[PDB]
Amino acid sequence: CPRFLKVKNWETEVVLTDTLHLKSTLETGCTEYICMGSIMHPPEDVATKDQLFPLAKEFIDQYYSSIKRFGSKAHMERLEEVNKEIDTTSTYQLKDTELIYGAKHAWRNASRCVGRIQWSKLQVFDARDCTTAHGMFNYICNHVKYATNKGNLRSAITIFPQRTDGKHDFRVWNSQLIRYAGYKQPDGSTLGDPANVQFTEICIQQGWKPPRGRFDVLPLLLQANGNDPELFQIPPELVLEVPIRHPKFEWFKDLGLKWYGLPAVSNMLLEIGGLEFSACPFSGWYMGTEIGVRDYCDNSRYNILEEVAKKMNLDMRKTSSLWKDQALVEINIAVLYSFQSDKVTIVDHHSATESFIKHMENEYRCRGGCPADWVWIVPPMSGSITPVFHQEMLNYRLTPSFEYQPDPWNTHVWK
Amino acid sequence: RFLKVKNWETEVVLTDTLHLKSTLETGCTEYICMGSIMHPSATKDQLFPLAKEFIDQYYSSIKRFGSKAHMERLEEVNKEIDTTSTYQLKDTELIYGAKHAWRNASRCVGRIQWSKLQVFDARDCTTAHGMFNYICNHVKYATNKGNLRSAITIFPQRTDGKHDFRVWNSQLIRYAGYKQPDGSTLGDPANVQFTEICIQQGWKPPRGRFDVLPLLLQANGNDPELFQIPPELVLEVPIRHPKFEWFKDLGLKWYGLPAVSNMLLEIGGLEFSACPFSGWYMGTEIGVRDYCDNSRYNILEEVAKKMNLDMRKTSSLWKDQALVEINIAVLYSFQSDKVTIVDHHSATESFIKHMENEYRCRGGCPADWVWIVPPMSGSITPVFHQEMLNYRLTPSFEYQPDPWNTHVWK
Numbered sequence: 001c002p003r004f005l006k007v008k009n010w011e012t013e014v015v016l017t018d019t020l021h022l023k024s025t026l027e028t029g030c031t032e033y034i035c036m037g038s039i040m041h042p043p044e045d046v047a048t049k050d051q052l053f054p055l056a057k058e059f060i061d062q063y064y065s066s067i068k069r070f071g072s073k074a075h076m077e078r079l080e081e082v083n084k085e086i087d088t089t090s091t092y093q094l095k096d097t098e099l100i101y102g103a104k105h106a107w108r109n110a111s112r113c114v115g116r117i118q119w120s121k122l123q124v125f126d127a128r129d130c131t132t133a134h135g136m137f138n139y140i141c142n143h144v145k146y147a148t149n150k151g152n153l154r155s156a157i158t159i160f161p162q163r164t165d166g167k168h169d170f171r172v173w174n175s176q177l178i179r180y181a182g183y184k185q186p187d188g189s190t191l192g193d194p195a196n197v198q199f200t201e202i203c204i205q206q207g208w209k210p211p212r213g214r215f216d217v218l219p220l221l222l223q224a225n226g227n228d229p230e231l232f233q234i235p236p237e238l239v240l241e242v243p244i245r246h247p248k249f250e251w252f253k254d255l256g257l258k259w260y261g262l263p264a265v266s267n268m269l270l271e272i273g274g275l276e277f278s279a280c281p282f283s284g285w286y287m288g289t290e291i292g293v294r295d296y297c298d299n300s301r302y303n304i305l306e307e308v309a310k311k312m313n314l315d316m317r318k319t320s321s322l323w324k325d326q327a328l329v330e331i332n333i334a335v336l337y338s339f340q341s342d343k344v345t346i347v348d349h350h351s352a353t354e355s356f357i358k359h360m361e362n363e364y365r366c367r368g369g370c371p372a373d374w375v376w377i378v379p380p381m382s383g384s385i386t387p388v389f390h391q392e393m394l395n396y397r398l399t400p401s402f403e404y405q406p407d408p409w410n411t412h413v414w415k
Numbered sequence: 416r417f418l419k420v421k422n423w424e425t426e427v428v429l430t431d432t433l434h435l436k437s438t439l440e441t442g443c444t445e446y447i448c449m450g451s452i453m454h455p456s457a458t459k460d461q462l463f464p465l466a467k468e469f470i471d472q473y474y475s476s477i478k479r480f481g482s483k484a485h486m487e488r489l490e491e492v493n494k495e496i497d498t499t500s501t502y503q504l505k506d507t508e509l510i511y512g513a514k515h516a517w518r519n520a521s522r523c524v525g526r527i528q529w530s531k532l533q534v535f536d537a538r539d540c541t542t543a544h545g546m547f548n549y550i551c552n553h554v555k556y557a558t559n560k561g562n563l564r565s566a567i568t569i570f571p572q573r574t575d576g577k578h579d580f581r582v583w584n585s586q587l588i589r590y591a592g593y594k595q596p597d598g599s600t601l602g603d604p605a606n607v608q609f610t611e612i613c614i615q616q617g618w619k620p621p622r623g624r625f626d627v628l629p630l631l632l633q634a635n636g637n638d639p640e641l642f643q644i645p646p647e648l649v650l651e652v653p654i655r656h657p658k659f660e661w662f663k664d665l666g667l668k669w670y671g672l673p674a675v676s677n678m679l680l681e682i683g684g685l686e687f688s689a690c691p692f693s694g695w696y697m698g699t700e701i702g703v704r705d706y707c708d709n710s711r712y713n714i715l716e717e718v719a720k721k722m723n724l725d726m727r728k729t730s731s732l733w734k735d736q737a738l739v740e741i742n743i744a745v746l747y748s749f750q751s752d753k754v755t756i757v758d759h760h761s762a763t764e765s766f767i768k769h770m771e772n773e774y775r776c777r778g779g780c781p782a783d784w785v786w787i788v789p790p791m792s793g794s795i796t797p798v799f800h801q802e803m804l805n806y807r808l809t810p811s812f813e814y815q816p817d818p819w820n821t822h823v824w825k
């Protein structure tokens with residue numbers, strides 16, 4: 001691999017030089033012959049002693065380099081203490097400092113995240129002392145209340161105990177901490193969020209009494225130490241919601257739409273120094289298009305374009321009237337207006353992509369690069385009028401990292 | 416191995432076997448993906464295997480692989496590479512190769528049309544005047560009084576690199592751009608440099624906002640020469656809006672013929688450095704990129720003014736509102752003037768149908784998601800949710816250096 005790679009911005013002519021890609025670890029999925037850049041996802045199997053030694057050393061070296069203590073006595077002593085741990089116990093425990101550093105860098109390294117200008121302002125909650133699902137519930141409730149902060153949202157992550165043999169995993173079965181239920185009807189229609197029908201049916205099987213509405217917050221389904229998961233209802237006062245109204249169309253409120261304020265991903269795996277944190281829910285704040293374009297206007301989601309177009313009285317007979325595009329904008333205007341009126345942190349796609357360009361440029365200057373997944377970074381509407389559209393990006397995998405993992409109902413051995 | 420692609424909206428999975436036939440590089444490695452890089456970075460010995468592969472797939476496509484005609488052509492080509500260091504394609508091979516370079520263009524959402532391509536053989540051309548004549552016939556044929564027809568005109572192949580045929584215009588029809596004294600730019604700012612080369616070569620600019628640039632044509636490595644396309648051959652559409660009567664007052668127009676003339680067509684190891692090809696527009700190419708890119712006509716401000724939109728904060732989405740209206744006007748204008756155009760909903764629809772066709776009859780379809788997804792309203796078009804595999808099949812269209820950086824003037 002060459003030592004310098006150049007990326008160009010085609011709107012501004014700015015050229016940046018990437019050297020950080022020389023630290024890339026795992027595979028992208030691509031080869032010299034095929035690019036998998038648009039592929040979304042390109043047991044008791046755990047790291048062995050021989051696999052763990054170099055992964056820990058690499059991480060510890062990186063941590064001590066970051067604190068300007070590389071080669072120091074504390075660096076060599078930490079390396080020796082970790083090596084002894086992996087020898088006698090075939091794993092090791094991170095220090096609180098290293099845990100915080102690793103989590104912030106997994107975010108910093110997350111190539112699909114447009115919000116990384118905030119990466120160093122992450123509140124890390126250490127929940128490695130948790131033993132039961134009730135305790136996981138307590139930790140998640142605290143996370144939610146802290147991150148929500150009455151609408152002045154703060155980014156946060158709660159980290160449950162790492163994987164040991166793979167048969168004792170901590171898992172949040174929810175894909176996100178706050179989601180709305182989906183219900184398949186006998187006639188084939190769906191009520192609520194069609195994306196969540198499978199998980200909703202799991203919750204119902206596990207004992208959840210479904211209120212069968214359009215916006216029913218799903219219960220938490222929480223697995224501690226490999227045991228069967230347990231259901232808990234998030235106290236509704238901790239779930240901040242925003243009714244969606246429009247600054248011009250008085251009728252928009254009559255659509256009865258709302259959404260929750262806190263985007264909190266809970267199905268990903270956090271890898272730090274070869275250790276695997278299978279339950280690491282993290283939350284930030286929404287970019288408006290995640291709600292106004294994807295949640296509301298995906299055909300397989302709430303799919304409200306038709307109804308909004310009708311109330312806008314648009315010609316829905318020709319696609320070339322762009323009635324869909326026209327209604328999409330008004331929906332996203334309403335979502336941003338509703339969050340701002342209620343003083344709930346949200347960012348529009350223009351501000352967020354401009355901030356990301358400034359972040360990426362800083363990372364190139366200070367760090368030697370910034371891995372970025374153009375397919376995910378560019379917003380799902382108005383792409384070319386945002387600056388990221390015109391920005392060439394390089395995508396590669398740095399560790400610490402957030403990774404996908406199998407859905408736990410596909411792997412869990414029921415007690 | 417066999418590679419699978421899923422559509423996340425329909426859950427349709429397709430199976431790709433065609434990728435096993437690629438050989439050119441994508442630009443990526445197992446450790447770095449360059450999928451958003453626009454431009455990632457022959458003797459008798461290099462040439463025959465490339466010729467062999469192309470002839471092999473041609474005779475396979477007409478179902479006479481290993482036939483006597485196939486064997487004789489392989490022999491005829493070898494004897495020709497021996498004695499001339501190159502070879503000439505048969506007419507049937509030229510047409511098949513041009514259609515398949517289009518079929519293989521991973522960045523083109525229009526490929527459902529690939530087999531309906533009119534191929535104009537211009538390999539007997541020797542002068543820039545001859546090139547001008549051929550390009551005029553192309554434009555008239557492809558324009559067809561608004562009922563646009565896909566076409567390509569193929570000039571002589573590269574011989575030594577010193578006698579290249581080149582269309583210096585990046586596209587056959589474009590508007591000039593002029594650097595003003597007061598700093599800003601009149602016309603199309605992407606073309607300021609090319610416009611200045613035309614002026615420097617003697618072109619008398621009208622210094623309007625929509626001045627069709629002259630053709631600048633290079634034959635056989637000679638200095639390029641200027642030619643004015645006769646105006647009755649250049650079809651244009653004044654842009655108006657179905658509801659905003661003030662929209663025509665903006666004074667906007669565009670040309671109907673999109674015609675790429677700066678690319679290189681590779682067929683069986685031969686290089687055609689001048690191969691202008693044309694189709695018809697997708698409306699977003701004009702309404703989003705040409706008019707609303709900050710480095711182009713940059714009219715969002717003005718349109719948002721006349722729409723009276725609140726422009727004091729981005730979260731009003733004033734830019735997004737103005738953008739949709741501009742693209743309504745463009746589609747409405749071309750449709751009213753019966754000039755062929757396709758909106759991004761219909762175009763991406765067709766491309767999904769195309770992909771399914773290609774996976775079934777051919778085992779795959781190389782596609783570049785970064786270029787295929789339209790520059791506006793991405794996720795409400797079906798390609799957004801379609802996984803695509805990108806890989807390089809030959810015959811192909813390739814980028815090449817700009818002629819003004821390589822040409823030694825005479």
Ligand code: HEM
Pocket residue numbers: 103106107110112113114115116118122155156157282283284285286287290347352376402
């Ligand atoms: C603080 C404000 C934040 C904003 C505005 C933001 C924005 C976004 C957006 C718009 C996406 C695309 C999501 C989608 O389309 O489903 C995304 C993805 C992602 N973000 Fe951020 N994010 C924020 C905070 C965070 C934090 C705190 C973390 C981790 C500690 C994080 C890690 C990620 C990851 C790993 C992805 C990829 C998700 C996936 O592959 O499904 N983000 N972000």
Ligand code: HEM
Pocket residue numbers: 513517520522523524525526528532565566567692693694695696697700757762786812
């Ligand atoms: C018939 C209607 C056609 C439509 C609607 C169409 C649509 C498009 C669009 C929207 C692009 C993106 C252009 C850009 O953003 O600059 C594109 C690219 C491309 N098209 Fe098609 N196209 C058509 C015909 C053709 C034909 C006839 C050929 C060749 C014979 C062709 C070959 C290509 C190539 C090579 C590219 C990539 C250009 C580049 O990399 O800059 N297309 N097409």
Ligand SMILES: Cc1cc(N)nc(CCc2cc(F)cc(C#CCN(C)C)c2)c1
Pocket residue numbers: 115176178179263264265282283284285286287290
């Ligand atoms: C930390 C963070 C910030 C932000 N601003 N956004 C996200 C993603 C939030 C989210 C919410 C949700 F309800 C569903 C999904 C998803 C998904 C998977 N997708 C392929 C359908 C993601 C995370």
Ligand SMILES: Cc1cc(N)nc(CCc2cc(F)cc(C#CCN(C)C)c2)c1
Pocket residue numbers: 586588589673674675692693694695696697700
């Ligand atoms: C065959 C065809 C059909 C179509 N529908 N469209 C095209 C592209 C047309 C075009 C016109 C133009 F005037 C400029 C460009 C460009 C460019 C380079 N870009 C990276 C800035 C492309 C080609």
Ligand SMILES: C[C@H](O)[C@H](O)[C@H]1CNc2nc(N)[nH]c(=O)c2N1
Pocket residue numbers: 038039040375376377423799800801802803
């Ligand atoms: C097939 C394609 O990769 C898929 O639709 C991706 C496209 N880009 C995306 N970008 C973001 N931010 N979120 C997504 O869910 C997707 N989906």
Ligand SMILES: C[C@H](O)[C@H](O)[C@H]1CNc2nc(N)[nH]c(=O)c2N1
Pocket residue numbers: 010389390391392393451452453785786787
């Ligand atoms: C950096 C990025 O590759 C570049 O802006 C691309 C993105 N996608 C595109 N897609 C099309 N059709 N045309 C373009 O010019 C571009 N530009």
Ligand SMILES: [Zn+2]
Pocket residue numbers: 030031034035036037443447448449450
């Ligand atoms: Zn790639």
